[PDB]
């Protein structure tokens, strides 16, 4: 965990095809990691 | 040929191929050595998402080519 | 158009791939040049 | 159909062809030009590679079109 970007405020397209349509492992790391956290947690 | 694929974490996979190879033949083979189902697969090769119904020539995939990994999630 | 990028941190793939997967004239130079040197380049 | 060609220093090359023009047919033109032979040959448009077996028209590639030359470099 170390300099990362805040995604609590995108949206299923955003992550869906910004992981579809890019290809920065980062951003595919934090945007699953986030995407499941939704789906597990709630807050 | 020989193409590589990077995992999220960084775990690379190297797997054996030819230009023929369709890309569902590949995520084929990754299922078999990790556990990921093609559903929840996605090779991607910088800015460039492999389709299911193309091959390892349809987009100059050339050998040692390093294929990025990601976890394929639901929608609709 | 001025000063170039030190892509020594690079990787064959990537720098390749960046040739057969980018479209920068400057970037297409610049990772050129780093590959002519590598094989230029011989300690 | 009159295109361009830019180089890598910055040297460009007017070349005439035509949309039904094969992507070989040009990276021969070139190699007559200067001395670059096709297989070391590598064109660029709209921010997408031109494939061998295709045409110009096959990238809506019209006139005075920009294509950026690249030496595919040899190697793996």
Same mark, same amino acid.
């Given at each position: 965990? !170390?300099?990362?970007?805040?995604?609590?405020?995108?949206?299923? &397209?955003?992550? %869906?095809? !910004?992981?579809?349509?890019?290809?920065?492992?980062?951003?595919? &790391?934090?945007? %699953?990691?986030?995407?499941?956290?939704?789906?597990?947690?709630?807050? | 040929?020989?193409?590589?694929?990077?995992?999220?974490?960084?775990?690379?996979?190297?797997?054996?191929?030819?230009?023929?190879?369709?890309?569902?033949?590949?995520?084929?083979?990754?299922?078999?050595?990790?556990?990921?189902?093609?559903?929840?697969?996605?090779?991607?090769?910088?800015?460039?998402?492999?389709?299911?119904?193309?091959?390892?020539?349809?987009?100059?995939?050339?050998?040692?080519?390093?294929?990025?990994?990601?976890?394929?999630?639901?929608?609709?």
């Amino acid at each position: 965990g !170390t300099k990362k970007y805040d995604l609590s405020k995108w949206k299923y &397209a955003e992550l %869906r095809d !910004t992981i579809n349509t890019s290809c920065d492992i980062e951003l595919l &790391a934090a945007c %699953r990691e986030e995407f499941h956290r939704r789906l597990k947690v709630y807050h | 040929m020989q193409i590589f694929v990077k995992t999220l974490t960084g775990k690379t996979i190297t797997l054996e191929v030819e230009p023929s190879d369709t890309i569902e033949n590949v995520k084929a083979k990754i299922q078999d050595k990790e556990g990921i189902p093609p559903d929840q697969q996605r090779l991607i090769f910088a800015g460039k998402q492999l389709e299911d119904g193309r091959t390892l020539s349809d987009y100059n995939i050339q050998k040692e080519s390093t294929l990025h990994l990601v976890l394929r999630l639901r929608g609709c």
